[PDB]
Nucleic acid binder design. Sequence first.
RNA 1: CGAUGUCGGCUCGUCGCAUCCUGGGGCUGAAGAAGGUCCCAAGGGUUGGGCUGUUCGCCCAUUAAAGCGGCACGCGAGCUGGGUUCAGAACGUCGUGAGACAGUUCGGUCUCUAUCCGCCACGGGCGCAGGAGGCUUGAGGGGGGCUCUUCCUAGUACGAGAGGACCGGAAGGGACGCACCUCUGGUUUCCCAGCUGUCCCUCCAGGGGCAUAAGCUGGGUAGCCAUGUGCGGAAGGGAUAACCGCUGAAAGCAUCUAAGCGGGAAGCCCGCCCCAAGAUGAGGCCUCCCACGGCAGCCGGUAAGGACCCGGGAAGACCACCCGGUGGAUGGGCCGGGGGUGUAAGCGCCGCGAGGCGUUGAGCCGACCGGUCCCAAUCGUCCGAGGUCU
RNA 2: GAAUGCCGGCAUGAGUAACGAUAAAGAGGGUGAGAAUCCCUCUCGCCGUAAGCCCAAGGGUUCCUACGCAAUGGUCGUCAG
RNA 3: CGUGAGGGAAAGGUGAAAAGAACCCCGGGAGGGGAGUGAAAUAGAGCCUGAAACCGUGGGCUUACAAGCAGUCACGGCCCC
Lengths: 118, 59, 131, 204, 122
Amino acid sequence: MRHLKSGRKLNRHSSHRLALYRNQAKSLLTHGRITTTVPKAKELRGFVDHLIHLAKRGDLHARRLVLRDLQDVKLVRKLFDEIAPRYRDRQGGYTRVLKLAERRRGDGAPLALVELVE
Amino acid sequence: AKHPVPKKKTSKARRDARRSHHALTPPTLVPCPECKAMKPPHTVCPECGYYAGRKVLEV
Amino acid sequence: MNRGALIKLVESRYVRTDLPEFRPGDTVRVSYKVKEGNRTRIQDFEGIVIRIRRNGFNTTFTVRKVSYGVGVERIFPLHSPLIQKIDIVQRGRARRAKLYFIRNLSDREIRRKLRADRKRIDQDRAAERAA
Amino acid sequence: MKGILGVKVGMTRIFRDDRAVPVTVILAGPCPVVQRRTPEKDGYTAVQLGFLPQNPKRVNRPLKGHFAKAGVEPVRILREIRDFNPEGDTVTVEIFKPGERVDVTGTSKGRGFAGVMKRWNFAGGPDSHGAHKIHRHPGSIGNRKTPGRVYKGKKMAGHYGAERVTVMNLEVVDVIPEENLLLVKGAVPGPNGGLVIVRETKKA
Amino acid sequence: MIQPQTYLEVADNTGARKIMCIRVLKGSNAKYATVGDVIVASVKEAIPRGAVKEGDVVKAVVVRTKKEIKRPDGSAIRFDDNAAVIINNQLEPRGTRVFGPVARELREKGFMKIVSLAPEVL
RNA sequence: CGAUGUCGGCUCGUCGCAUCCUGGGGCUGAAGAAGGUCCCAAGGGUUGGGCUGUUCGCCCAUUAAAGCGGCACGCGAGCUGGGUUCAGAACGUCGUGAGACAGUUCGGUCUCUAUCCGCCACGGGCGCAGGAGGCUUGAGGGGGGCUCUUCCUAGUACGAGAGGACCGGAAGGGACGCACCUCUGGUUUCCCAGCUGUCCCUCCAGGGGCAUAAGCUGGGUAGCCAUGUGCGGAAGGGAUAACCGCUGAAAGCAUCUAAGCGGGAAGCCCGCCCCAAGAUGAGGCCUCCCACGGCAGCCGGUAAGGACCCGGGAAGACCACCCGGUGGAUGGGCCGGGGGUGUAAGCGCCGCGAGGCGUUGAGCCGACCGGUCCCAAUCGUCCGAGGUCU
RNA sequence: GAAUGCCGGCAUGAGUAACGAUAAAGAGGGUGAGAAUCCCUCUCGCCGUAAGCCCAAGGGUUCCUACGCAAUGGUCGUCAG
RNA sequence: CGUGAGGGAAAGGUGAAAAGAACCCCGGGAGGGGAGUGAAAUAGAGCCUGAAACCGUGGGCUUACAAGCAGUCACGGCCCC
Ligand SMILES: CC[C@H]1OC(=O)[C@H](C)C(=O)[C@H](C)[C@@H](O[C@@H]2O[C@H](C)C[C@H](N(C)C)[C@H]2O)[C@](C)(OC)C[C@@H](C)C(=O)[C@H](C)[C@H]2N(CCCCn3cnc(-c4cccnc4)c3)C(=O)O[C@]12C
Ligand SMILES: [Mg+2]
Ligand SMILES: [Mg+2]
Ligand SMILES: [Mg+2]
Ligand SMILES: [Mg+2]
Ligand SMILES: [Mg+2]
Ligand SMILES: [Mg+2]
Ligand SMILES: [Mg+2]
Ligand SMILES: [Mg+2]
Ligand SMILES: [Mg+2]
Ligand SMILES: [Mg+2]
Ligand SMILES: [Mg+2]
Ligand SMILES: [Mg+2]
Ligand SMILES: [Mg+2]
Ligand SMILES: [Mg+2]
Ligand SMILES: [Mg+2]
Ligand SMILES: [Mg+2]
Ligand SMILES: [Mg+2]
Ligand SMILES: [Mg+2]
Ligand SMILES: [Mg+2]
Ligand SMILES: [Mg+2]
Ligand SMILES: [Mg+2]
Ligand SMILES: [Mg+2]
Ligand SMILES: [Mg+2]
Ligand SMILES: [Mg+2]
Ligand SMILES: [Mg+2]
Ligand SMILES: [Mg+2]
Ligand SMILES: [Mg+2]
Ligand SMILES: [Mg+2]
Ligand SMILES: [Mg+2]
Ligand SMILES: [Mg+2]
Ligand SMILES: [Mg+2]
Ligand SMILES: [Mg+2]
Ligand SMILES: [Mg+2]
Ligand SMILES: [Mg+2]
Ligand SMILES: [Mg+2]
Ligand SMILES: [Mg+2]
Ligand SMILES: [Mg+2]
Ligand SMILES: [Mg+2]
Ligand SMILES: [Mg+2]
Ligand SMILES: [Mg+2]
Ligand SMILES: [Mg+2]
Ligand SMILES: [Mg+2]
Ligand SMILES: [Mg+2]
Ligand SMILES: [Mg+2]
Ligand SMILES: [Mg+2]
Ligand SMILES: [Mg+2]
Ligand SMILES: [Mg+2]
Ligand SMILES: [Mg+2]
Ligand SMILES: [Mg+2]
Ligand SMILES: [Mg+2]
Ligand SMILES: [Mg+2]
Ligand SMILES: [Mg+2]
Ligand SMILES: [Mg+2]
Ligand SMILES: [Mg+2]
Ligand SMILES: [Mg+2]
Ligand SMILES: [Mg+2]
Ligand SMILES: [Mg+2]
Ligand SMILES: [Mg+2]
Ligand SMILES: [Mg+2]
Ligand SMILES: [Mg+2]
Ligand SMILES: [Mg+2]
Ligand SMILES: [Mg+2]
Ligand SMILES: [Mg+2]
Ligand SMILES: [Mg+2]
Ligand SMILES: [Mg+2]
Ligand SMILES: [Mg+2]
Ligand SMILES: [Mg+2]
Ligand SMILES: [Mg+2]
Ligand SMILES: [Mg+2]
Ligand SMILES: [Mg+2]
Ligand SMILES: [Mg+2]
Ligand SMILES: [Mg+2]
Ligand SMILES: [Mg+2]
Ligand SMILES: [Mg+2]
Ligand SMILES: [Mg+2]
Ligand SMILES: [Mg+2]
Ligand SMILES: [Mg+2]
Ligand SMILES: [Mg+2]
Ligand SMILES: [Mg+2]
Ligand SMILES: [Mg+2]
Ligand SMILES: [Mg+2]
Ligand SMILES: [Mg+2]
Ligand SMILES: [Mg+2]
Ligand SMILES: [Mg+2]
Ligand SMILES: [Mg+2]
Ligand SMILES: [Mg+2]
Ligand SMILES: [Mg+2]
Ligand SMILES: [Mg+2]
Ligand SMILES: [Mg+2]
Ligand SMILES: [Mg+2]
Ligand SMILES: [Mg+2]
Ligand SMILES: [Mg+2]
Ligand SMILES: [Mg+2]
Ligand SMILES: [Mg+2]
Ligand SMILES: [Mg+2]
Ligand SMILES: [Mg+2]
Ligand SMILES: [Mg+2]
Ligand SMILES: [Mg+2]
Ligand SMILES: [Mg+2]
Ligand SMILES: [Mg+2]
Ligand SMILES: [Mg+2]
Ligand SMILES: [Mg+2]
Ligand SMILES: [Mg+2]
Ligand SMILES: [Mg+2]
Ligand SMILES: [Mg+2]
Ligand SMILES: [Mg+2]
Ligand SMILES: [Mg+2]
Ligand SMILES: [Mg+2]
Ligand SMILES: [Mg+2]
Ligand SMILES: [Mg+2]
Ligand SMILES: [Mg+2]
Ligand SMILES: [Mg+2]
Ligand SMILES: [Mg+2]
Ligand SMILES: [Mg+2]
Ligand SMILES: [Mg+2]
Ligand SMILES: [Mg+2]
Ligand SMILES: [Mg+2]
Ligand SMILES: [Mg+2]
Ligand SMILES: [Mg+2]
Ligand SMILES: [Mg+2]
Ligand SMILES: [Mg+2]
Ligand SMILES: [Mg+2]
Ligand SMILES: [Mg+2]
Ligand SMILES: [Mg+2]
Ligand SMILES: [Mg+2]
Ligand SMILES: [Mg+2]
Ligand SMILES: [Mg+2]
Ligand SMILES: [Mg+2]
Ligand SMILES: [Mg+2]
Ligand SMILES: [Mg+2]
Ligand SMILES: [Mg+2]
Ligand SMILES: [Mg+2]
Ligand SMILES: [Mg+2]
Ligand SMILES: [Mg+2]
Ligand SMILES: [Mg+2]
Ligand SMILES: [Mg+2]
Ligand SMILES: [Mg+2]
Ligand SMILES: [Mg+2]
Ligand SMILES: [Mg+2]
Ligand SMILES: [Mg+2]
Ligand SMILES: [Mg+2]
Ligand SMILES: [Mg+2]
Ligand SMILES: [Mg+2]
Ligand SMILES: [Mg+2]
Ligand SMILES: [Mg+2]
Ligand SMILES: [Mg+2]
Ligand SMILES: [Mg+2]
Ligand SMILES: [Mg+2]
Ligand SMILES: [Mg+2]
Ligand SMILES: [Mg+2]
Ligand SMILES: [Mg+2]
Ligand SMILES: [Mg+2]
Ligand SMILES: [Mg+2]
Ligand SMILES: [Mg+2]
Ligand SMILES: [Mg+2]
Ligand SMILES: [Mg+2]
Ligand SMILES: [Mg+2]
Ligand SMILES: [Mg+2]
Ligand SMILES: [Mg+2]
Ligand SMILES: [Mg+2]
Ligand SMILES: [Mg+2]
Ligand SMILES: [Mg+2]
Ligand SMILES: [Mg+2]
Ligand SMILES: [Mg+2]
Ligand SMILES: [Mg+2]
Ligand SMILES: [Mg+2]
Ligand SMILES: [Mg+2]
Ligand SMILES: [Mg+2]
Ligand SMILES: [Mg+2]
Ligand SMILES: [Mg+2]
Ligand SMILES: [Mg+2]
Ligand SMILES: [Mg+2]
Ligand SMILES: [Mg+2]
Ligand SMILES: [Mg+2]
Ligand SMILES: [Mg+2]
Ligand SMILES: [Mg+2]
Ligand SMILES: [Mg+2]
Ligand SMILES: [Mg+2]
Ligand SMILES: [Mg+2]
Ligand SMILES: [Mg+2]
Ligand SMILES: [Mg+2]
Ligand SMILES: [Mg+2]
Ligand SMILES: [Mg+2]
Ligand SMILES: [Mg+2]
Ligand SMILES: [Mg+2]
Ligand SMILES: [Mg+2]
Ligand SMILES: [Mg+2]
Ligand SMILES: [Mg+2]
Ligand SMILES: [Mg+2]
Ligand SMILES: [Mg+2]
Ligand SMILES: [Mg+2]
Ligand SMILES: [Mg+2]
Ligand SMILES: [Mg+2]
Ligand SMILES: [Mg+2]
Ligand SMILES: [Mg+2]
Ligand SMILES: [Mg+2]
Ligand SMILES: [Mg+2]
Ligand SMILES: [Mg+2]
Ligand SMILES: [Mg+2]
Ligand SMILES: [Mg+2]
Ligand SMILES: [Mg+2]
Ligand SMILES: [Mg+2]
Ligand SMILES: [Mg+2]
Ligand SMILES: [Mg+2]
Ligand SMILES: [Mg+2]
Ligand SMILES: [Mg+2]
Ligand SMILES: [Mg+2]
Ligand SMILES: [Mg+2]
Ligand SMILES: [Mg+2]
Ligand SMILES: [Mg+2]
Ligand SMILES: [Mg+2]
Ligand SMILES: [Mg+2]
Ligand SMILES: [Mg+2]
Ligand SMILES: [Mg+2]
Ligand SMILES: [Mg+2]
Ligand SMILES: [Mg+2]
Ligand SMILES: [Mg+2]
Ligand SMILES: [Mg+2]
Ligand SMILES: [Mg+2]
Ligand SMILES: [Mg+2]
Ligand SMILES: [Mg+2]
Ligand SMILES: [Mg+2]
Ligand SMILES: [Mg+2]
Ligand SMILES: [Mg+2]
Ligand SMILES: [Mg+2]
Ligand SMILES: [Mg+2]
Ligand SMILES: [Mg+2]
Ligand SMILES: [Mg+2]
Ligand SMILES: [Mg+2]
Ligand SMILES: [Mg+2]
Ligand SMILES: [Mg+2]
Ligand SMILES: [Mg+2]
Ligand SMILES: [Zn+2]
């Protein structure tokens, strides 16, 4: 049973899964768009939306909170200065997942794109 | 345990009857409204990069 | 439908608002309606609040005292009709929500760990100055 | 016999005569009568009740005709109460009063594929003293050459729950008609939001 | 929530200090005794020259439990020890004094003398 | 004997009845209460522990009772491996000896993958003469079935007394079963906080990794849960067993019987709960579609509808089932509430300092209860009646 | 036609068990007919009295570079002992 | 294979003549389709003949209420000559 349990496991123990989300966040925030598997793409939305939403608040506390996950001061600086301002009037939904047509050859994996919204 | 083992060779009939559920189902495909190419529903079109009426990626 | 709101609605007939706010580590006196033989009476239970278990109407709190060489804990529904009144006897300052660790402490060690909460003793005395 | 369709909303407890009373709260009515079952037409007596209004778009034509014939707005659920013929054309929570006893039918919570210990309360095996990969196993399932087989109905692992269950003789603790609410003392099958059926009890 | 093997403190002045439950006297196979239930116990420790001595097979009513006791008013009570008072076959206390508080459940279950000896009834 | 694994235990049952208990009886050297003996009865029940490898048995504490047997002395492709019965070693004993006993003593490899039948669960197919969406009848199955104490009747009947009822009526239990999570109590692998060592970011401050597949520790929501909560065993109707009769011959009397009628068990049928029309004997009711082209058959396009795909779900191994798909609150975000943690950072002030105080119940914040189209369920596709004969 | 015969071929079990340490991965760029698996960059994790470095046995070209991917590699392969 | 003494395989055939398939086409290649050679190409080099087990594709009859050492006897239906 899994009744009313939220959150995928992705066959990673607790610290590997956390490092998966952080690493994917750095990549999404760096390039604006990444291709990954559908299940990972779905999980990445909420993780990154929260860091973007903290970047919209702008205060020092939010910057230190975000650094806990992103670590890279220059990346956080881009998130606070360039990324967050274009979402001032957008309330949630800062990321978009769309599914790709071709599966990965070596293992059949369904793939999807994740990206920041305009 | 004590190494269970098949008691009799499976007949051609019984082998192939077990396989009565093995035929693949064809991939479901819809036309892309932009370039008319066949492609799976709910995916970005791989021939022209359109989805939901706009261009999403370079093809 | 809003299931949470119907439940709160059912509970609305039974919520109390007359009782004073308290924290784990405060010392409290519970005047409690008790049935014996053949009458019913009010019995006071005074002790340290070691636990407040919140759930709206269903929150409960646990008070701990020593009675004649024996530790006793009583668990009380915060909105029980059998509670006549609760009197704050003393404000203690804890550092955590659950004070189970005092079950293993000497009387001296407890007094050392739950010192008087001057901030809330002052705030209690500032209030209590009414029209 | 009387009954009503309902939704299990949640549990709490009330205080009554200085006693805490655990209750399950049920949003029961209102239930329009949609079809009556008569001995002449159907060979038995019952009333098909409806429950919860439905977005008419989602109502196909055979269902639409069914609701039309007994001039009734479109409803999400049809269930019959056997041997019940209410005088009116709408069944509400007021068919029960505080103090009555009711039976409640729900769909129990689904355990999925359940082991022999969870489903049947088997004792399993020892966890030390040499026990070898059988800590939750069922043990023997038979004898030897006589009878050389396993009984029908032998208790084994498998799907457990998400099944019809009736709990009997529950006390009605309160009725709140302004909210179509029924307060039933104790536990009722299934999850919050689950469809339930509340009927007058069969225990004398 | 007492069972065979459980040690209990002796809340009286019989001479016993520790008893070990060997039986819950509640039907043919009750698993546990709670406050107000009677047990059969071996006396495992006693002060010299008491009414009871080590090895005696005695009866006692449970007066305090470390497993909290639920009450119909929705409250509960819990003590720091498991304690019993040694009785005779009339449910009468064999000692003359009772030490520490006792569960109010004793009253309705018929141990009026033990309840009135106790310094507090909770 | 080209192998049918052995004692005992554990696990899981199931059956017999020569019945241990509970239910119904007759006889008694049956006053009552308690027994004894036989009859009917297998529905349910039949405890925990000390000793010993033990089965058995003895003992302790209870109990309504602590039944006895069968199932390859039931059950090792289910577990154990204490006993016994390979190789080591020793004792007693026998033998000149090598060795031996069934005597004793310490030790001593129990094999991941189930093909068929069978069993528990779950799909796919076709069928149920037209095709569909609903709601149902219950043939037939299954589940369940235990019992004690106290009080009233009444200290009455009975008895010198001790003691102490029937019938009838209350209350409260034990164990067991089903469901549940309000409370009590768990867990809660990252929801919060504190802590050590080390390395790092960025020097301070503030943080991050690692110390487990949570580094450790104090807590902990939803869920899943029992130690927690609700409820169940019936009631009632019918037919019986032993047993007791009514009327009554054969047989002027007598006889429960030969004609006929009555009473009478926890047991039998039904009643309760669950499955159930593949019940091919394929049932019933409500509603929807329709007489389409070309050549009881065929080809194609549609109808009522259905499937695919997608967002999901206290549903779930998969599949199934159920909800939703912009005509939308389905998941994700965001917002509010609940809930947890327990007063963040930064700044100010006191202190040489570790720290402390204020801002501040602050900050953070999974799942729970809701709101909100910000993000995503785009766009679509494919099946699908034309109704045989008397 | 049988010798648990001999040699060879081909079936069944079955798309089943397994793919050999639970130190762990993610993304971007490149190459190419083809890329989870090759090269490059960033991030993450693991060893660090070693899972780093040197020598002796033993092995015998496995070393370096270019061109290759039928087979060998437990998948893949443009890579490679 | 075995430290070693020692053990110890499997594996023959295009055609008369290489005339061993230029060139084009799909394919990265492998492979194939044409062209062409040959009396013959299911003689195309994985090559004479090419059995059997075993695996496919197409067609006829048959099968989802049925009890089976699988056949045999009978009758009937459908298909073929
Ligand atoms: C552990 C696996 C073994 O099974 C058992 O051991 C099993 C538990 C049995 O005992 C089995 C049931 C036996 O049959 C019984 O024989 C009896 C005499 C009669 C019985 N009757 C009931 C018929 C019959 O059932 C017998 C004879 O096995 C010896 C079967 C016989 C065919 C075998 O010899 C057989 C091939 C065994 N073997 C020799 C083991 C040598 C010793 N070894 C043990 N462990 C290791 C080891 C190696 C490496 C690492 N760790 C450990 C080595 C293996 O390599 O594998 C075995 C199957
Ligand atoms: Mg489940
Ligand atoms: Mg699990
Ligand atoms: Mg969800
Ligand atoms: Mg999940
Ligand atoms: Mg997580
Ligand atoms: Mg998931
Ligand atoms: Mg995982
Ligand atoms: Mg995996
Ligand atoms: Mg992994
Ligand atoms: Mg983990
Ligand atoms: Mg870790
Ligand atoms: Mg890690
Ligand atoms: Mg979140
Ligand atoms: Mg998509
Ligand atoms: Mg796809
Ligand atoms: Mg690949
Ligand atoms: Mg085994
Ligand atoms: Mg075995
Ligand atoms: Mg096996
Ligand atoms: Mg094993
Ligand atoms: Mg095996
Ligand atoms: Mg076999
Ligand atoms: Mg074959
Ligand atoms: Mg075949
Ligand atoms: Mg088969
Ligand atoms: Mg192109
Ligand atoms: Mg609620
Ligand atoms: Mg409301
Ligand atoms: Mg008092
Ligand atoms: Mg104290
Ligand atoms: Mg009052
Ligand atoms: Mg239901
Ligand atoms: Mg199990
Ligand atoms: Mg269990
Ligand atoms: Mg169960
Ligand atoms: Mg067990
Ligand atoms: Mg266990
Ligand atoms: Mg054990
Ligand atoms: Mg073992
Ligand atoms: Mg184990
Ligand atoms: Mg087993
Ligand atoms: Mg056997
Ligand atoms: Mg048989
Ligand atoms: Mg199910
Ligand atoms: Mg009320
Ligand atoms: Mg629920
Ligand atoms: Mg004491
Ligand atoms: Mg002594
Ligand atoms: Mg033999
Ligand atoms: Mg053999
Ligand atoms: Mg044999
Ligand atoms: Mg054999
Ligand atoms: Mg024997
Ligand atoms: Mg038996
Ligand atoms: Mg008999
Ligand atoms: Mg009897
Ligand atoms: Mg009797
Ligand atoms: Mg008598
Ligand atoms: Mg007598
Ligand atoms: Mg007498
Ligand atoms: Mg008798
Ligand atoms: Mg007799
Ligand atoms: Mg008799
Ligand atoms: Mg019986
Ligand atoms: Mg039986
Ligand atoms: Mg029996
Ligand atoms: Mg012992
Ligand atoms: Mg001992
Ligand atoms: Mg024992
Ligand atoms: Mg014994
Ligand atoms: Mg022993
Ligand atoms: Mg013996
Ligand atoms: Mg003896
Ligand atoms: Mg007794
Ligand atoms: Mg008796
Ligand atoms: Mg015993
Ligand atoms: Mg036997
Ligand atoms: Mg025998
Ligand atoms: Mg024998
Ligand atoms: Mg046996
Ligand atoms: Mg036996
Ligand atoms: Mg056996
Ligand atoms: Mg074995
Ligand atoms: Mg055995
Ligand atoms: Mg066996
Ligand atoms: Mg076997
Ligand atoms: Mg077996
Ligand atoms: Mg066997
Ligand atoms: Mg054993
Ligand atoms: Mg042994
Ligand atoms: Mg031994
Ligand atoms: Mg012995
Ligand atoms: Mg032996
Ligand atoms: Mg041997
Ligand atoms: Mg030996
Ligand atoms: Mg010796
Ligand atoms: Mg000697
Ligand atoms: Mg001899
Ligand atoms: Mg001898
Ligand atoms: Mg001699
Ligand atoms: Mg000698
Ligand atoms: Mg011999
Ligand atoms: Mg011997
Ligand atoms: Mg010896
Ligand atoms: Mg040893
Ligand atoms: Mg031995
Ligand atoms: Mg031995
Ligand atoms: Mg083993
Ligand atoms: Mg063996
Ligand atoms: Mg084996
Ligand atoms: Mg396998
Ligand atoms: Mg099988
Ligand atoms: Mg078979
Ligand atoms: Mg199907
Ligand atoms: Mg089906
Ligand atoms: Mg039936
Ligand atoms: Mg049948
Ligand atoms: Mg039945
Ligand atoms: Mg009386
Ligand atoms: Mg008299
Ligand atoms: Mg009575
Ligand atoms: Mg009862
Ligand atoms: Mg809750
Ligand atoms: Mg809880
Ligand atoms: Mg709670
Ligand atoms: Mg709790
Ligand atoms: Mg805890
Ligand atoms: Mg966290
Ligand atoms: Mg650190
Ligand atoms: Mg640096
Ligand atoms: Mg620092
Ligand atoms: Mg590191
Ligand atoms: Mg490390
Ligand atoms: Mg680690
Ligand atoms: Mg940590
Ligand atoms: Mg620590
Ligand atoms: Mg913890
Ligand atoms: Mg929780
Ligand atoms: Mg329980
Ligand atoms: Mg009960
Ligand atoms: Mg007469
Ligand atoms: Mg005569
Ligand atoms: Mg007659
Ligand atoms: Mg009669
Ligand atoms: Mg009669
Ligand atoms: Mg009579
Ligand atoms: Mg009768
Ligand atoms: Mg009964
Ligand atoms: Mg049904
Ligand atoms: Mg049907
Ligand atoms: Mg049906
Ligand atoms: Mg039949
Ligand atoms: Mg039908
Ligand atoms: Mg019908
Ligand atoms: Mg349509
Ligand atoms: Mg449906
Ligand atoms: Mg749908
Ligand atoms: Mg659509
Ligand atoms: Mg739309
Ligand atoms: Mg939504
Ligand atoms: Mg939402
Ligand atoms: Mg929220
Ligand atoms: Mg809040
Ligand atoms: Mg709060
Ligand atoms: Mg502060
Ligand atoms: Mg601060
Ligand atoms: Mg200063
Ligand atoms: Mg200060
Ligand atoms: Mg919040
Ligand atoms: Mg939108
Ligand atoms: Mg709206
Ligand atoms: Mg389309
Ligand atoms: Mg021959
Ligand atoms: Mg053979
Ligand atoms: Mg062979
Ligand atoms: Mg053989
Ligand atoms: Mg051979
Ligand atoms: Mg041969
Ligand atoms: Mg051979
Ligand atoms: Mg061969
Ligand atoms: Mg094969
Ligand atoms: Mg083979
Ligand atoms: Mg498969
Ligand atoms: Mg298999
Ligand atoms: Mg498998
Ligand atoms: Mg596998
Ligand atoms: Mg492995
Ligand atoms: Mg591996
Ligand atoms: Mg690339
Ligand atoms: Mg790449
Ligand atoms: Mg690759
Ligand atoms: Mg590749
Ligand atoms: Mg590289
Ligand atoms: Mg070092
Ligand atoms: Mg070499
Ligand atoms: Mg070199
Ligand atoms: Mg080289
Ligand atoms: Mg190299
Ligand atoms: Mg190269
Ligand atoms: Mg290669
Ligand atoms: Mg290759
Ligand atoms: Mg290749
Ligand atoms: Mg290879
Ligand atoms: Mg390869
Ligand atoms: Mg390999
Ligand atoms: Mg290349
Ligand atoms: Mg290589
Ligand atoms: Mg050799
Ligand atoms: Mg060699
Ligand atoms: Mg040789
Ligand atoms: Mg040769
Ligand atoms: Mg030639
Ligand atoms: Mg030649
Ligand atoms: Mg020639
Ligand atoms: Mg090419
Ligand atoms: Mg080309
Ligand atoms: Mg070529
Ligand atoms: Mg070709
Ligand atoms: Mg060619
Ligand atoms: Mg030619
Ligand atoms: Mg010729
Ligand atoms: Mg030829
Ligand atoms: Mg030829
Ligand atoms: Mg020739
Ligand atoms: Mg040839
Ligand atoms: Mg050939
Ligand atoms: Mg051939
Ligand atoms: Mg064919
Ligand atoms: Mg039939
Ligand atoms: Mg047929
Ligand atoms: Mg025949
Ligand atoms: Mg004939
Ligand atoms: Zn397109």
